[PDB]
């Protein structure tokens, strides 16, 4: 199959405005949310129907308890960072963990933290060490690296358990995750040529312009891949017309193993 990934995010906020949760945790398979938990509901809940339909209530009950523990841990950790930074006011703490199963069968695994939305600590599961961005992170690095067994545990989770979870969820959601919806592609004149694609799944797509059979990366404007709201995506790319000389322009789209060319006459 194509490349797929599993990742879990956590967000803690130290002094949230009224109503807004102190803690949020959301899981994703590829671009799809699968799970959610926050400090207001204090419940882990499905975010995709093929998760709800395949995981029994004991799963949600058990991880609800773990998440209540992780929420308290996240608050303690953020309190410690903000004390060490000598920071007043509201600050954020984030974690991301997960893995990728690549098309060729290889795997990757990652775990990192951020403070105020910037890299703070990054785990290297091959050297079994934490990269620190500053001296507050460095203090935390020292304490985490003194617990060699927890490092080994995280390497095992990233390399073995995460990949097993991903394969299990990929099969649960195979009707959604493993389908293909090819793009509808057109060109219009707006002077610039706009190559537009819509209606496609998965969101990964490569669109570019060629000028007489040569790519022009520096002159091409690349639009974002955007959710259309119905489970499919849209995207575009534009290139500016030289009004002083004609050229053979052509838009090239690659999606899910199929290449297409729209040669503009």
């Amino acid at each position, epitope marked *: 199959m194509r490349t797929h990934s599993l990742r879990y995010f956590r967000l803690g906020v130290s002094d949230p405005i009224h109503g807004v949760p102190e803690f949020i945790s959301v899981g994703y398979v590829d671009s799809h949310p699968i799970t959610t938990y926050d400090s207001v509901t*204090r419940q882990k809940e499905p975010r995709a129907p093929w998760m709800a339909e395949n995981l029994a209530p004991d799963h949600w009950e*058990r991880y609800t*308890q773990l998440l209540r*523990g992780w929420q*308290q841990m996240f608050k303690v950790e953020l309190k410690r960072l903000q004390r060490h930074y000598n920071h007043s006011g509201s600050h954020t703490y984030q974690r991301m963990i997960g893995c990728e199963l690549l098309e060729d069968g290889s795997t990757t695994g990652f775990l990192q933290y951020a403070y105020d939305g910037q890299d703070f600590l990054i785990f290297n599961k091959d050297t079994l060490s934490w990269l620190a961005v500053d001296n507050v992170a460095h203090t935390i690095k020292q304490a985490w690296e003194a*617990n060699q067994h*927890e490092l080994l545990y995280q390497k*095992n989770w990233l390399e*073995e358990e995460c990949i097993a979870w991903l394969k299990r969820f990929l099969e649960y959601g195979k009707d959604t995750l493993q389908r293909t919806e090819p793009p509808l592609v057109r060109v219009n004149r707006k002077t610039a040529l706009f190559c537009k694609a819509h209606g496609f799944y998965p969101p990964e797509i490569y669109m570019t312009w060629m000028k007489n059979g040569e790519e022009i990366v520096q002159e091409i404007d690349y639009g974002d891949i955007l959710p259309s709201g119905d489970g499919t995506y849209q995207a575009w790319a534009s290139i500016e017309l030289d009004p002083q000389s004609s050229n053979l322009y052509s838009c090239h789209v690659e999606h899910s193993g199929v290449h297409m060319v729209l040669q503009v006459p």
Partner: antibody
Amino acid sequence: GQNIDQPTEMTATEGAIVQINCTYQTSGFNGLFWYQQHAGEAPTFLSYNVLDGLEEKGRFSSFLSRSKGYSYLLLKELQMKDSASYLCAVKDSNYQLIWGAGTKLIIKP
Amino acid sequence: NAGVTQTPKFQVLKTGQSMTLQCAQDMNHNSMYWYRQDPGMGLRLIYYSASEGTTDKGEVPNGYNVSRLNKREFSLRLESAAPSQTSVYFCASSVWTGEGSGELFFGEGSRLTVLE
């Protein structure tokens, strides 16, 4: 279901070596623990393994093979005070601890 | 520096009698557990508390209830004792839970015998 197996009882001679085996079949694996429990007392933590290989800690070493689903606790230069039960335990995919029934180690002076 | 302190060490009960076992830990741990140990089988979790302010059932919750009173204390209640609850009960705690490598610290054990 998930199962963990270890022999009920083992007997060895003072000064010798003993290997206590633990085999597990679990849904996911987040590490294997060994505990010592003297008769009438609380279990206390001996070792943790989660990657493959041998780890040493005094006269005790603990080995793990994830692919075989196997660990042993190796006790060298046995002494009478090693007479105790030895409990194996495995954390499954959901961090639930699955406990073996324990191996009673008897040491002949 | 006492670790995990549970009481009582021994107790005899008549079928139908109520009993509370106390457990406290002074290690600033977040997770607490109540286990029973019976001949011929591995420890079985009765109830646990992953953090202050939450509790949930273990493998053998029926006939028991728990109260995580504060960060330090986790009491186990037998409302109507049954002969099958004759056992050795162990309270335990750990720094956090889900931390894969974190080990358990056990109390000294409470031996209950329930008689008709």
